A paper describes a structure:
VACV protein N1 is an intracellular virulence factor that is expressed early during infection and modulates innate immunity by at least two strategies: preventing apoptosis and inhibiting NF-κB activation. The VACV Bcl-2-like proteins N1, B14 and A52 all form dimers via a common surface comprising alpha helices 1 and 6 (the ‘1–6 face’). Biochemical and structural analysis of these mutants demonstrates that the anti-apoptotic activity of N1 relies on a hydrophobic groove on the surface of the protein and that the anti-NF-κB activity requires an intact dimer interface.
To determine if the point mutations introduced in N1 generated unanticipated structural changes, R58Y, Q61Y and R71Y N1 were expressed in bacteria, purified to homogeneity and their structures determined at 3.0–3.1 Å resolution. All three mutants crystallized in the same space group as wild-type N1 and the overall structures of all three closely resembled the wild-type protein (0.21–0.39 Å r.m.s. deviation over 108 Cα atoms). In contrast, a R71Y mutation placed the tyrosine flat on the base of the groove. Introduction of the groove-filling mutations R58Y and Q61Y abolished the ability of N1 to prevent apoptosis, while mutants R71Y and I6E inhibited STS-induced apoptosis as strongly as WT N1. Interestingly, groove mutant R71Y which retains the ability to prevent STS-mediated apoptosis, associated with Bad. Consistent with this, WT N1 and mutant I6E and R71Y all retain an open surface groove, bind Bid and Bad, and inhibit apoptosis. However, infection with vN1.R58Y or vN1.R71Y induced lesions that were indistinguishable from vN1.WT.
Numbering used by the authors:
A (entry chain C): 1 to 114
B (entry chain D): 1 to 17, 20 to 114
The structure:
């Protein structure tokens, strides 16, 4: 699940068809869980501060259920999409936090998605 | 370069499936002796951890050739450890990129 998620988020950032996988379609359905106004706000702040800081702060918030985890995947995905490929983000730091929160739900997320 | 490298190492581990980019990166494999990888894999298995890999990656990088080796050692370990291996790859990337980040520009030039 770790690999698939790293791959999906990076793909959401550059949208390189060379690195596309069919398991991304199911993950993309989680986008409905995130309001675009929240993303707009988050992106604006990232740009305001010239950092991944605001993203990392959002990812550092508690995950108490699978729906919380699904949201975190989707917020990462939409931020990755909207921030642009030129964006010099140390993605591994975001993955560190994301997986620290969602890791436990991997098995159940695998079930819920496939 | 960060993205390409994350993609290459993960691909080396398990085959997602193809571009020219990975071909150039694969040429760096000659820099790493397979006996060193065999040893590293053996230790990882002995300890049931990425610990030995992380220890290798935490060693100093003083030139581009040092950086090229680190990419290749990561690649061959990724290959030889197997897909089933529950490795927190992001921790390896954290250390790898902490060492090699400065060389990204020159590595981009040297490879393409």
């Amino acid at each position: 699940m770790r690999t698939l998620l790293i791959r999906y988020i990076l793909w959401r950032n550059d949208n390189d068809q060379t690195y596309y996988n069919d398991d991304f379609k199911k993950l993309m359905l989680l986008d409905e869980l995130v309001d675009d106004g929240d993303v707009s706000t988050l992106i604006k702040n990232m740009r305001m501060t010239l950092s991944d800081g605001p993203l990392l702060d959002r990812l550092n918030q508690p995950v108490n259920n699978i729906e919380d985890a699904k949201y975190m995947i989707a917020i990462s995905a939409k931020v990755a999409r909207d921030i642009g490929e030129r964006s010099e983000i140390r993605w591994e730091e975001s993955f560190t936090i994301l997986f620290r929160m969602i890791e436990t739900y991997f098995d159940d997320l695998m079930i819920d998605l496939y």
